[PDB]
Amino acid sequence: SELTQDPAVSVALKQTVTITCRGDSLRSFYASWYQKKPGQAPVLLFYGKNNRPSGIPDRFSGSASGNRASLTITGAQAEDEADYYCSSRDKSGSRLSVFGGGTKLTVLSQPKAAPSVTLFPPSSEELQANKATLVCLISDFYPGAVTVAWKADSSPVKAGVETTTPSKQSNNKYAASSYLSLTPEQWKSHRSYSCQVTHEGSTVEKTVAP
Amino acid sequence: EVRLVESGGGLVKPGGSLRLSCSASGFDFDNAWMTWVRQPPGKGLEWVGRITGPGEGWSVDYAESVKGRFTISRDNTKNTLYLEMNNVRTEDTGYYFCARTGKYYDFWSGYPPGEEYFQDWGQGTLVIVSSASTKGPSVFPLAPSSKSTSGGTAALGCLVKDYFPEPVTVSWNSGALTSGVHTFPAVLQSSGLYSLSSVVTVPSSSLGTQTYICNVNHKPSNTKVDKKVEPK
């Protein structure tokens, strides 16, 4: 994880957005930038000091300062909605390459919208099968990017978590789901578990108890 | 005119071996550097390795995550790059892409040969690492409750656990109920098995009266499960 990017950003049409990767190796190297849409190959947008491949619209420009490499879209358009990845050396003297974690860019078509969250506890039936799954369902949010944190009592839980990528529902708004797998003893031994959804820096937390 | 096409993706068990191919056209393959990149489900791009040209002796470098397990090679007479995946792990699941690779340099600005960049990419091939064979789902109710309800609307659903392979389809009331239904994409778990959920938002006033049944179809296992979902 030597190149770090925010997982999500949004931009309004015609506005300027900068997506930034941070890494120690970027003090010494330029970074290249890639656009990735679902179902499509990544495309190289910019590399080096100032190189933009033919075919790439000139509103994409790459810059660098300190340990940050930046892709600026001056005047975002709807077709710019995409995941954006940077890539560079992991370190000086390395023959290896690395990518940043990716930034999902939403090009707003709408005012942003907060999520609705419903947390279901394990069913008694699943506990009877010696299993326990908490199901955290998240709906109606825009942009379609959320961060999910689970807690046992007040302590963060990272093991046993699976979370789907947001996808549009039949009503054109986004939904996601997250799952926390526990043993029945883990479920019954705590006072509560919680599913906390962060969206646009605001949070909704649902709690259940055995 | 540059074309890259990956092939060979499929299912392989942990510890197994799989060979991927990438066929190239429209450029001088012989002297081109070629890179493999992968993307796990819902994750970012990860650099797997790169093979250089004859000037560098067909030298190969690997990400630490795959070193010692994957081997990259090429057959220029066929314009083909290969990825030999050995001792596969669940974490190798994902789309694998090949990319024509350049190394950035600029004599004018005194920038020495430096980072690599990926000028043209194929569409990728999917590798699924799972020890699983056909396995029907277990279906549990997500029962409506005061906790699942906000005034006049209640959420309820069905949790469809630990099946293989994809796909599972879910209907409600044999297809009579579509408004407010969302069936989520499956998660491939570390176990090599899939799980998904289907939720329906319905009128809270209806919970006493109306029957809600999720119909789970897993045709790979020849399984159908109907689960009537009621308040707890």
Author numbering:
A (entry chain L): 2 to 9, 11 to 95, 95A, 95B, 95C, 96 to 209
B (entry chain H): 1 to 52, 52A, 52B, 52C, 53 to 82, 82A, 82B, 82C, ...
Article, verbatim:
Antibody 10E8 is one of the broadest monoclonal antibodies thus far identified that effectively neutralizes diverse strains of HIV-1. It targets the membrane-proximal external region (MPER) of the HIV-1 viral spike with a highly hydrophobic antigen-binding region. Here we show cis-trans conformational isomerization of the Tyr-Pro-Pro (YPP) motif in the heavy chain 3rd complementarity-determining region (CDR H3) of antibody 10E8 to be the mechanistic basis of its multipeak behavior. Overall, our results show how a conformationally dynamic cis-proline and the interaction between the CDR H3 and the CDR L1 of 10E8 appear to provide exactly the requisite degree of structural plasticity needed for a highly hydrophobic surface to recognize an MPER epitope.
